[PDB]
């Protein structure tokens, strides 16, 4: 762990972070579409924080929790969701269900709190957003589902620009057995893969891509849709569609592309209430311990010297380095602010709101 300064001012008069506002709102999201606010240049209180929401628990991996306390950070980002309760045990470090193989991968390298806490069901409505705009151009609007259900995914497909999951009408209008549906795709995108064969008696047997869906399908390398595992930062590349839901029977170039609710496959959803709270879960990214200015006010810090006359390492109002300070009187301090800089932007005098006092900062 980097050092702190033997020099250290915080900046005074920064706002509260209002952590806990962030984690009780009532519009709670799904893993699905996870939801991430960046904490920066902001006073958090740790205690408080715990006691303001329901926590049932509170760890951190690559970090001494006890550590947090009186601490500053370059950023604190934290991410959160509702937990369907069939899925808590996903949210264990380095699982590979569903939760993080296909909605929120928790990093592991970084140093890092899981939050578990809960907010009283009848005053939280579940917010569950499908984030694939592949999806969405294609159909995929909303989710019809009970209150407190939260949607996740157990299966993430990807697609390049140029997809369309709609068999071309020209292609279907000569199809006897097995006709695909069909309709116009976007200028710019190919109409699916299909192919009409003879078999047995079968003049005209059409076969498309994707068969039987793209999560069971036969054959993957024919098949447009591509697995996905979410990482670090990634939400959900897609729900996988079955194309046989895609289009209309007899669609001609007058119909655009278009799936239907129910082919869009390959996830499920469970209540997050027990207890008659909603169970929810938030990452805790630390970033930059002992630096930056997104600092803990769960102690008093009892500001120490500054050391003079001696080359000293400095955290001064977020601005780092390394400088002898020499204490001047106030005459020769030549600005208003509490840091003074030279032409080329370094810093070269310092004013310590704890005592009013001056210094000079040279070079070491
Ligand atoms: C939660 O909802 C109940 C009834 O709908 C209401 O009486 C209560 O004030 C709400 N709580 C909050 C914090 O808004
Ligand atoms: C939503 O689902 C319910 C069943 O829970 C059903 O009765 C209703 O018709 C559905 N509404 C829409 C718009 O699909
Ligand atoms: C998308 O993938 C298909 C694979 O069949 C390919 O034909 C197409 O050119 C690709 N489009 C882009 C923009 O890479
Ligand atoms: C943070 O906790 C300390 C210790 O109890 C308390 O004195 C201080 O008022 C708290 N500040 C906030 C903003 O909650």
Redesign the pocket.
Known sequence: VKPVATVHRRIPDLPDCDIDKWLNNFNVPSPLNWERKIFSNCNFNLSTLLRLVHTDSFSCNNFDESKIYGSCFKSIVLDKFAIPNSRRSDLQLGSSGFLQSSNYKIDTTSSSCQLYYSLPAINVTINNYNPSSWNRRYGFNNF???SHSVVYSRYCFSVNNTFCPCAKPSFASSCKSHKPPSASCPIGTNYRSCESTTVLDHTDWCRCSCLPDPITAYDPRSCSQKKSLVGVGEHCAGFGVDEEKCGVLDGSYNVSCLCS?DAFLGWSYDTCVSNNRCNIFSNFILNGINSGTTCSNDLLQPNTEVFTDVCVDYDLYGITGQGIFKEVSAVYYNSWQNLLYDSNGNIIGFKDFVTNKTYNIFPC
């Open positions: 019809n589902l009970s609710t």
